[PDB]
Short mmCIF file of C-alpha atoms in Angstrom, two decimals:
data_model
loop_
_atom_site.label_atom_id
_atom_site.label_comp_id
_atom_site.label_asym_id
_atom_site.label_seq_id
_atom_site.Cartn_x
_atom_site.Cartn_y
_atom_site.Cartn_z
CA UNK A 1 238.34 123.28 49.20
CA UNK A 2 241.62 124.98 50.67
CA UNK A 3 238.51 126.93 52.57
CA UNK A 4 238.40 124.25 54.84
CA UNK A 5 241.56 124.50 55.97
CA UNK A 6 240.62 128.31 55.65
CA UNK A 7 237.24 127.89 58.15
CA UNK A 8 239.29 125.49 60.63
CA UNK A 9 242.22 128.09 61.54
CA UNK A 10 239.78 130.54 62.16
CA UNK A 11 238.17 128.46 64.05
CA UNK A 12 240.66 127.92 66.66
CA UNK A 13 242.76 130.96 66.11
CA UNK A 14 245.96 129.97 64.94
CA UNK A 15 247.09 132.38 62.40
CA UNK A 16 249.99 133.21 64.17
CA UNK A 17 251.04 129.20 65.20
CA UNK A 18 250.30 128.87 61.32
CA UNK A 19 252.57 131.95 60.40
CA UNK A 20 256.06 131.25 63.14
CA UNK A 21 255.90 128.07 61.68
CA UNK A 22 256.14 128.69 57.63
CA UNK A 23 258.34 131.87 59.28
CA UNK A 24 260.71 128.97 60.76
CA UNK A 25 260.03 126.39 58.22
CA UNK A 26 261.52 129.15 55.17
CA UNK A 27 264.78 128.88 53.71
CA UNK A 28 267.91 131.38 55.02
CA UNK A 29 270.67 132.04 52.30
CA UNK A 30 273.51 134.29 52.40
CA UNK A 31 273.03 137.91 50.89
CA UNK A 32 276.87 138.42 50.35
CA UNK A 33 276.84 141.18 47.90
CA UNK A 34 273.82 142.53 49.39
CA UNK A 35 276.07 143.45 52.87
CA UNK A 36 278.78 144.45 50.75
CA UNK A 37 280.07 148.44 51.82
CA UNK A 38 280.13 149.37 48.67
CA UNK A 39 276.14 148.95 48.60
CA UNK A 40 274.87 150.28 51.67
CA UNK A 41 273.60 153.16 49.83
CA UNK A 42 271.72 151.18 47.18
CA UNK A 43 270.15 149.16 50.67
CA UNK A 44 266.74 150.71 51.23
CA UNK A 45 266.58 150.89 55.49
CA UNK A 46 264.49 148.58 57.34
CA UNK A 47 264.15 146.78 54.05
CA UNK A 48 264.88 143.00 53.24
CA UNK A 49 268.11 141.68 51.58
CA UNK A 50 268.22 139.67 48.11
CA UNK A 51 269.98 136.01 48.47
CA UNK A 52 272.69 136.06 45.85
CA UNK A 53 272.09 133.11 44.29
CA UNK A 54 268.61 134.70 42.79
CA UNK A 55 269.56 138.71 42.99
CA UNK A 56 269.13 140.41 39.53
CA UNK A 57 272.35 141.43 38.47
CA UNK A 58 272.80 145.47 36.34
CA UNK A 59 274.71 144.75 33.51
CA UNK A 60 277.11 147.45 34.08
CA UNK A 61 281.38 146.20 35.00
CA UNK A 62 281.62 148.57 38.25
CA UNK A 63 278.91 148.16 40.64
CA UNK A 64 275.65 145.64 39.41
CA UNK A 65 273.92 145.57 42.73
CA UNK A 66 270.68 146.34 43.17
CA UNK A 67 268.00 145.13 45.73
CA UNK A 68 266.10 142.97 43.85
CA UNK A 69 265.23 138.77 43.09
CA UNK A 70 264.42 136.57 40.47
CA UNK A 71 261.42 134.28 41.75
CA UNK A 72 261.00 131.45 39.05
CA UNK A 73 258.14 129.46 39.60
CA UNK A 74 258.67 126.78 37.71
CA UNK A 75 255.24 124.46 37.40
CA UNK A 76 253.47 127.80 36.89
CA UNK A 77 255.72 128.99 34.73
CA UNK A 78 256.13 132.10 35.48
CA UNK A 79 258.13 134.26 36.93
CA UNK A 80 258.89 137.63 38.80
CA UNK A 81 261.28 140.33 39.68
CA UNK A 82 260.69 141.70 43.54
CA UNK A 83 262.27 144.65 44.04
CA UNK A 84 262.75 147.45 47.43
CA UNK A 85 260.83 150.77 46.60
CA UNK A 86 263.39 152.83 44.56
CA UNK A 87 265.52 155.25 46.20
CA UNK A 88 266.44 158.89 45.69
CA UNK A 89 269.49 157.73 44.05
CA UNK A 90 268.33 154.10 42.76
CA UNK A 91 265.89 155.29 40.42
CA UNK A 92 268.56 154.92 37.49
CA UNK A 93 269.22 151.35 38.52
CA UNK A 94 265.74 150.39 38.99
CA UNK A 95 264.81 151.30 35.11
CA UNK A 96 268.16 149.86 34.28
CA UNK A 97 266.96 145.99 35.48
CA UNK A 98 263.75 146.99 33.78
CA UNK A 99 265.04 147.41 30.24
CA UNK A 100 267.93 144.79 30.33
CA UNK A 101 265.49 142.43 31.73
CA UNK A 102 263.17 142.88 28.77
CA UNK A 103 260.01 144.27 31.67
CA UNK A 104 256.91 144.29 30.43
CA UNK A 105 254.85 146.00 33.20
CA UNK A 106 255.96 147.41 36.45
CA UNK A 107 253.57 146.70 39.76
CA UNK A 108 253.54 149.04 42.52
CA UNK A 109 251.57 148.10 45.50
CA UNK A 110 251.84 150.83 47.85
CA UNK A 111 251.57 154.90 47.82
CA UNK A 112 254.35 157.34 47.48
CA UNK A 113 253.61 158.64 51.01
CA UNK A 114 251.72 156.15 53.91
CA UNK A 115 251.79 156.76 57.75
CA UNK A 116 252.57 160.29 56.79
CA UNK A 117 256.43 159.35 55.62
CA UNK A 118 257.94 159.02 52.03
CA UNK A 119 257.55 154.78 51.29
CA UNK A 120 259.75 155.48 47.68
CA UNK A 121 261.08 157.71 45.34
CA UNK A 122 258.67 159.64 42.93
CA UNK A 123 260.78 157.58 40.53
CA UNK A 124 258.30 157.72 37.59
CA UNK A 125 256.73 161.23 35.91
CA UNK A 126 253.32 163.09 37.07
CA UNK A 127 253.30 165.07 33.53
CA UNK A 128 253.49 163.89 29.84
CA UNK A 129 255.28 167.54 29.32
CA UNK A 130 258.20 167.42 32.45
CA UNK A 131 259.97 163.92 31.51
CA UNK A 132 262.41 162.19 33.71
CA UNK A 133 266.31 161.49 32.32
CA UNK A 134 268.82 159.47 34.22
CA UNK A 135 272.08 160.56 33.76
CA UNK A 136 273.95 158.12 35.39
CA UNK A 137 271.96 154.80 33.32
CA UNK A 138 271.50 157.14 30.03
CA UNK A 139 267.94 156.18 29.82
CA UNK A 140 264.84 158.95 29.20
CA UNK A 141 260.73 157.89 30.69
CA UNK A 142 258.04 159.89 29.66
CA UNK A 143 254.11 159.63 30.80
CA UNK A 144 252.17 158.69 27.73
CA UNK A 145 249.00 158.25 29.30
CA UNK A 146 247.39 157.84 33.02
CA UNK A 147 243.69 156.48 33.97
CA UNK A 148 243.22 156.78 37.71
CA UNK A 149 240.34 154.17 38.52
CA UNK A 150 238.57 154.19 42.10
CA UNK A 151 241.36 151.41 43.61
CA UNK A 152 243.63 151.84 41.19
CA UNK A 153 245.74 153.45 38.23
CA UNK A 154 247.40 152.28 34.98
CA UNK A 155 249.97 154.41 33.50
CA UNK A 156 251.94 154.20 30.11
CA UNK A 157 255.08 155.12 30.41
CA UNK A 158 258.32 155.43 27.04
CA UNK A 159 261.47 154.16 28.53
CA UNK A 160 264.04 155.25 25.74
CA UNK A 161 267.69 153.98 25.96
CA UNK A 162 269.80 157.30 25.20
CA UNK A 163 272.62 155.32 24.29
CA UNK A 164 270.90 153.16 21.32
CA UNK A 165 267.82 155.47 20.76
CA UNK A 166 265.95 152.38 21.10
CA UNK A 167 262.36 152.65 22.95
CA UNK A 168 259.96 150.95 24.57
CA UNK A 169 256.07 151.01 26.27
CA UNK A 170 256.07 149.60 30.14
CA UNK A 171 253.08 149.57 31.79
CA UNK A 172 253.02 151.08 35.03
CA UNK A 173 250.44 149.40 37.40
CA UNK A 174 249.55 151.26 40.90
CA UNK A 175 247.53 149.46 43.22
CA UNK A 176 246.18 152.66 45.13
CA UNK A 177 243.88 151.41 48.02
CA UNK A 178 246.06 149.29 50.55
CA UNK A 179 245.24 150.19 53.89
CA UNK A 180 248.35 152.35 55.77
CA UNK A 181 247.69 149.63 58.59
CA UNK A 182 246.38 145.64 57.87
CA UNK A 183 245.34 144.17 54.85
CA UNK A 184 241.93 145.26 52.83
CA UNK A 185 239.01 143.47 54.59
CA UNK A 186 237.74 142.26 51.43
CA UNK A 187 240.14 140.57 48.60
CA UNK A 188 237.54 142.00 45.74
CA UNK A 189 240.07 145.02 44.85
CA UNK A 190 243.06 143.55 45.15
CA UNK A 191 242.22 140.65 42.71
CA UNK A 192 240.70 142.95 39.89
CA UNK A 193 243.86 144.46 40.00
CA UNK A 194 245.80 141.34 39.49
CA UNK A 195 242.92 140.69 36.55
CA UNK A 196 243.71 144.20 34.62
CA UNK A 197 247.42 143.20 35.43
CA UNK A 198 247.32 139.70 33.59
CA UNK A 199 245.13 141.08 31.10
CA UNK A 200 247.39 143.58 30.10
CA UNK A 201 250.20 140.70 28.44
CA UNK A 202 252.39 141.97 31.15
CA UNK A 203 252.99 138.55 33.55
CA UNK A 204 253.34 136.64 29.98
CA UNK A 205 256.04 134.47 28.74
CA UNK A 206 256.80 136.46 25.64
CA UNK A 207 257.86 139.09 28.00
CA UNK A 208 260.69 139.50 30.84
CA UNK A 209 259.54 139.04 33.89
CA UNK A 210 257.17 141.97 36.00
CA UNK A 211 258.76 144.25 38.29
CA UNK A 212 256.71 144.23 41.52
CA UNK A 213 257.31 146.30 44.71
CA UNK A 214 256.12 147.63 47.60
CA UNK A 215 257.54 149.43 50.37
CA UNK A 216 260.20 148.65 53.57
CA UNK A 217 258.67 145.71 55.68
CA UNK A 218 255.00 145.81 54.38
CA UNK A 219 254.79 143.19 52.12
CA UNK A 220 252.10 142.88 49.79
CA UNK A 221 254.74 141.79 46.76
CA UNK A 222 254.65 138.23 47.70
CA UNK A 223 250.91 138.32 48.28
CA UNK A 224 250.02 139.68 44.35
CA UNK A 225 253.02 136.61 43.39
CA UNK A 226 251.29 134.04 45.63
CA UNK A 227 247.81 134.77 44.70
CA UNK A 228 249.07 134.89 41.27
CA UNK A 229 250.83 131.48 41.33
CA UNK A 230 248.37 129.63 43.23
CA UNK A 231 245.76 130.45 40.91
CA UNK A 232 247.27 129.83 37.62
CA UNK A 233 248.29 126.10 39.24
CA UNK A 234 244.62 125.77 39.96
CA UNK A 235 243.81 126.13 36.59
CA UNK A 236 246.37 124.10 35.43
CA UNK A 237 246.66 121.14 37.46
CA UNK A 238 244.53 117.78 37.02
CA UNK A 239 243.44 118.22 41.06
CA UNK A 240 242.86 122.02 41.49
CA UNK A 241 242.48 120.81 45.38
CA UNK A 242 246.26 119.92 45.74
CA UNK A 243 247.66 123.55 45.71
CA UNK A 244 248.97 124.25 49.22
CA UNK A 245 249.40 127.62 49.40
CA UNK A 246 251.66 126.91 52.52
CA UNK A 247 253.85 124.54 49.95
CA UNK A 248 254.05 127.34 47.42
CA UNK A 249 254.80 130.41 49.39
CA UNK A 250 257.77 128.04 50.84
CA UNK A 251 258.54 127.52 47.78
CA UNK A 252 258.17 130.85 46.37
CA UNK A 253 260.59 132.50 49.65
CA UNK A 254 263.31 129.64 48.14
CA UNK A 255 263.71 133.37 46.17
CA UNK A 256 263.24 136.18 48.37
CA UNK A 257 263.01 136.51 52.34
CA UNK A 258 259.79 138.41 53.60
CA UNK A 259 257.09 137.80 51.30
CA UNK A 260 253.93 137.68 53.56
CA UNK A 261 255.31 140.08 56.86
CA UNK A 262 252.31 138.86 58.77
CA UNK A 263 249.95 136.53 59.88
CA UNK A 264 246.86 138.69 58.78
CA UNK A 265 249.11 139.14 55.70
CA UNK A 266 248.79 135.02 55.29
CA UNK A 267 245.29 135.26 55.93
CA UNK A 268 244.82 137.42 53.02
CA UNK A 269 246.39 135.63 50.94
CA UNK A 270 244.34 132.33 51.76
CA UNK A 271 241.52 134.82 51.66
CA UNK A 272 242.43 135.62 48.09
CA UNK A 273 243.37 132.51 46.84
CA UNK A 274 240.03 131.10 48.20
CA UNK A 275 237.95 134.11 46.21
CA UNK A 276 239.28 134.51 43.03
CA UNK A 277 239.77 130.75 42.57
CA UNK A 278 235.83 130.67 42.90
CA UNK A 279 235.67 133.70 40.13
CA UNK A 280 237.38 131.75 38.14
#
């Protein structure tokens, strides 16, 4: 399989060789609006920028900035919203993109505090009674429900828009168990989570694209997307064996810049890729 080329790097060590080189290989495109003054405080620090030709646009005349991408993957077809870890005072724009771009599901892969230090706003409610309004987008969220699993927790959340009265269910999917430092040592979690994530309709056509995100210079976004991608071509192409996971994560940073921070990061991935393509 692709666990040849898997076996062979390990082999002879060359994660890293492997890693500069898709790092130098990956396309650079300018993030105009993204440097703008005007947004430095809707910048999360330390974090990436979005290219403009793929950043997701608010649909509000003033300011529609906000630190997040489109990545359409086209022969999969399927797509994704990668977003920074909302801010104190990006919360409102955050559920903004998720309503006007009809979000099923959102996909959190970090916690609210790692390493001792805040990684993103509590941007979503911990009681069904003490609901969150945000004045500045006019939309209400409310907790409807919350099962905390053993690596993981779903939560249903009621995003209402306070200017229509309109409503609607977004799943809320928290991928609890990441390490604070590396990458899990075994891909079993992570992929059961992607499982209960495309089982839930949320990655589907017949919605708008997820809303995934992590936390400033960790990652992890681009390895649920790749895994995710890679996959799905698998099981859709004539030759399963002619997925390069190299060619699609180039493909796939076309969209975004740092998806897969590391070379253990890339490993995973392959590591992923290479398990839950036997599970399935």
């Amino acid at each position: 399989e692709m666990e040849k080329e898997f076996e062979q790097i390990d082999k002879s060590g060359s994660w890293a060789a492997i890693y500069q080189d898709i790092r130098h290989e990956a396309s650079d495109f300018p993030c105009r609006v993204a440097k703008l003054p005007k947004n430095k405080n809707r910048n999360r620090y330390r974090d990436v920028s979005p290219f403009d030709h793929s950043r997701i646009k608010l649909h509000q005349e003033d300011n529609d900035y906000i630190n997040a991408s489109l990545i359409k993957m086209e022969e999969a077809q399927r797509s994704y919203i990668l977003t920074q870890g909302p801010l104190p005072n990006t919360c409102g724009h955050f559920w903004e993109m998720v309503w006007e771009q009809k979000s099923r599901g959102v996909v959190m892969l970090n916690r609210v505090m790692e390493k001792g230090s805040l990684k993103c706003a509590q941007y979503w409610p911990q009681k069904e009674e003490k609901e969150m309004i945000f004045e500045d987008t006019n939309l209400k969220l409310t907790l409807i429900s919350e099962d905390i699993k053993s690596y993981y927790t779903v939560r249903q959340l009621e995003l209402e828009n306070l200017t229509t009265q309109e409503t609607r269910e977004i799943l809320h999917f928290h991928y609890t168990t990441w390490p604070d430092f590396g990458v899990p040592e075994s891909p079993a979690s992570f992929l059961n989570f992607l499982f209960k994530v495309r089982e839930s309709g949320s990655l589907s056509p017949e919605h708008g694209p997820v809303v995934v995100h992590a936390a400033a210079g960790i990652g992890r976004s681009g390895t649920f997307c790749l895994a995710d991608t890679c996959l799905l071509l698998m099981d859709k192409r004539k030759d399963p064996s002619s997925v390069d996971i190299k060619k699609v994560l180039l493909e796939m940073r076309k969209f975004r810049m740092g998806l897969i921070q590391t070379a253990d990061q890339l490993r995973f991935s392959y590591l992923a890729v290479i398990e839950g393509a036997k599970f399935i």
